[PDB]
């Protein structure tokens, strides 16, 4: 066909050396980062569990044995220790990054190495948003937000000394004591102007640490707390990267509507995958404050 | 002081006289009883060196 303008793609995720106006991206300066990229807040707050399959079986102690006062020569009575079973399964995260081999040769030689930290951040954010907020089409059917919805363990109200203390107390009814708070930084304001109960210097609320979720789904007026040692996670597969030069990608299409063939079209793709698992060990251990 | 953790709430919202960081009330330590028999509104205090215990047989 002897056509030399660059290919247009849909959804247009392909990195290309030539722009459609004919600009050639030589002398390219590697992008620098305006931030420090986020860790997983699930992995920060929760407990790690070694896992080797994609399913794990838990046994937890549930009833402690009793004891008796016995007079001299009185009969000692018998008692029982009990346990409860639970289980967690893993699901797969993944992404593919397609690149033209002109881009990889002449523009950004190291792209598939410099992308790895950003792919890790994307997986951590996807996992946090799935397990805490129950958002982004989570697979587990288990989450903090769904536990709070199930137990109806919710306060409706403004950020006040009463409502924040009543929120913490709502756990201690069950003998569970709060271990942290989860917040959106857009509501530090509402924690600053109440009287003090909060300080930004440690970023602590009433002595507990506040952890910020860098996501759009936790709204202004909303605050979460719990005994986060009751949240358990595991990782059967650490992030694996496979680089491929000859696959088809069906999820990307040429301007003519065809799937993208990497061999005919002289392209490369990085596939990253990870297996990750979540368990909520006690669904009473979490509570939420929500605006009226 | 001896307390039930279900009443930390009532120690938090009085004005401060209590802090959870040390878990102290007016400078004394608060000790929590993990039992169902000490009710919500109830708080105990004393000079606990006046309480003496002994153990003739270890378990």
Curated annotation (Swiss-Prot), chain A:
It comes from Staphylococcus phage 80alpha. Forms homopentamers and homohexamers in the mature capsid forming a 63 nm icosahedral head with T=7 architecture. The procapsid is made up of hexamers and pentamers of this subunit. There are seven subunits in the asymmetric unit in the T=7 procapsid. Found in the procapsid with the scaffold protein in a 2:1 capsid protein:scaffold protein molecular ratio. The lineage of its organism: Viruses, Duplodnaviria, Heunggongvirae, Uroviricota, Caudoviricetes. Belongs to the HK97 phage major capsid protein family. InterPro entries: Phage_capsid (IPR024455), Phage_capsid-like_C (IPR054612). Keywords: Capsid protein, Late protein, Virion. The gene is gp47. Pfam families: Phage_capsid. It is found in: Virion. One of its GO terms (cellular component) is viral capsid. The N-terminus is cleaved by ribosomal processing protease Prp. Assembles to form an icosahedral capsid, as well as procapsid, with T=7 icosahedral symmetry. This is Major capsid protein.
Curated annotation (Swiss-Prot), chain B:
It is found in: Virion. The N-terminus is cleaved by ribosomal processing protease Prp. Forms homopentamers and homohexamers in the mature capsid forming a 63 nm icosahedral head with T=7 architecture. The procapsid is made up of hexamers and pentamers of this subunit. There are seven subunits in the asymmetric unit in the T=7 procapsid. Found in the procapsid with the scaffold protein in a 2:1 capsid protein:scaffold protein molecular ratio. Assembles to form an icosahedral capsid, as well as procapsid, with T=7 icosahedral symmetry. Belongs to the HK97 phage major capsid protein family. This is Major capsid protein.
